[PDB]
Amino acid sequence: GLMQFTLPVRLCKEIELFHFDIGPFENMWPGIFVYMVHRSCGTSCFELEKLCRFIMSVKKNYRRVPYHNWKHAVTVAHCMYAILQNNHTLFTDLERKGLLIACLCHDLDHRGFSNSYLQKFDHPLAALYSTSTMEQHHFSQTVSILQLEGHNIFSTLSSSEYEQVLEIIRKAIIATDLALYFGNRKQLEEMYQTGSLNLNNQSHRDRVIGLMMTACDLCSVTKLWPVTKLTANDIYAEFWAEGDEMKKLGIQPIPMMDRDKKDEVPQGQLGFYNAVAIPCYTTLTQILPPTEPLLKACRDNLSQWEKVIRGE
C-alpha cells in the first residue's frame, strides 16, 4: 500500500529546506520518511517491504497524545535529514542509517508524562529505568519492533554492524533526554573554543550527534512563527494534563504544567529559548555552519515571544 508511494515534485524541492513543515501532509508522512531514507542512504539500504512494515509498526506504537506523537516523530526525522544532507560527508553510512531511524523512534510510546513525574509518583518505568526513564523505554520499544516478524530492517548487516548501529541509536535516543543535553553543550562549546574539537575522536563525535538530536528534537522553534505558536499549544496541553494529575494527588505543579498559570508561558518560552534553544543552535552553527538557518529561525521566534510579552 505504502510501497508504491511517490513523493510530489514540489515537495521534492522543499523537503530539502530547514523550515519545511510536514504538518499539512499527514497521509504522506510514511512515504516522506521512506523518500528521506532513500535520498540520504540510497534506494537499496533496506528491503522496501521490511522498511514499510517497520515504518508503519512504529506509527502504530505512537499514541494520540497532543505533542509527543507520530507527527513529532516525522518532524524531528525531517530536521535530521536536512542536517545530514547539508553535512553529508562528515557522517558514515551506518550513522545516517541509524540516526534517521533513531529520530523516528525517539519517543516511541510516550504517554504525556515527564521523567520527573514517573519518578516521583513511583511507577514501573522508573523502577526498571532509574535515569532517562522514558528515553530508555523508547529505545526498548525500538528493538521490540526491530525484532518483529519481517520487521528486522538491519538483518542484512553483519553482527558487528548490527551492534554498532543499535549503539548509535541507543546513544542518540538517550541523548534526547533534555536533562543530559545541558552538560553536553558546555563540553562542545569548550571543545570548540579551545581549538580541540576533533570529529575523528569517537567520544567527541557522540557528543555532536547528541547535540544534533537536541537540535532536531527541538526544531519546532525553528519554523515560521504561526507553526511555532500552534505547536507550543500542543506541548502545553500535554504539560497541563500532567499538571492536573499532580493537582488530583494534592501537589501544585510547576507553573509550566499548571493550566491556571498560562499567563506565564510567554516568559517560560523566553527563558527556554535563552537557556536552551539559542545556545543549542548556537553551538551547532559553530560545529556545522551549514545549519545556520536553524539559529536564524530560533532568533526570529525569540523576538516573537518577546513581542508577545510587551503587548504585541
Ligand SMILES: CO[C@@H](C)Cn1cc(-c2c(C)nc3c(N4CCOCC4)nccn23)cn1
Ligand atoms: C515536562 O518536562 C518538564 C519537567 C521540564 N521541561 C520542559 C521542557 C520543555 C519546554 C518548556 N519546551 C519544550 C519543547 N518545545 C518548546 C516549545 O515548542 C515545542 C518544543 N520541547 C521539549 C521539551 N520542552 C523541557 N524540560
Ligand SMILES: [Mg+2]
Ligand atoms: Mg522524548
Ligand SMILES: [Zn+2]
Ligand atoms: Zn521528542
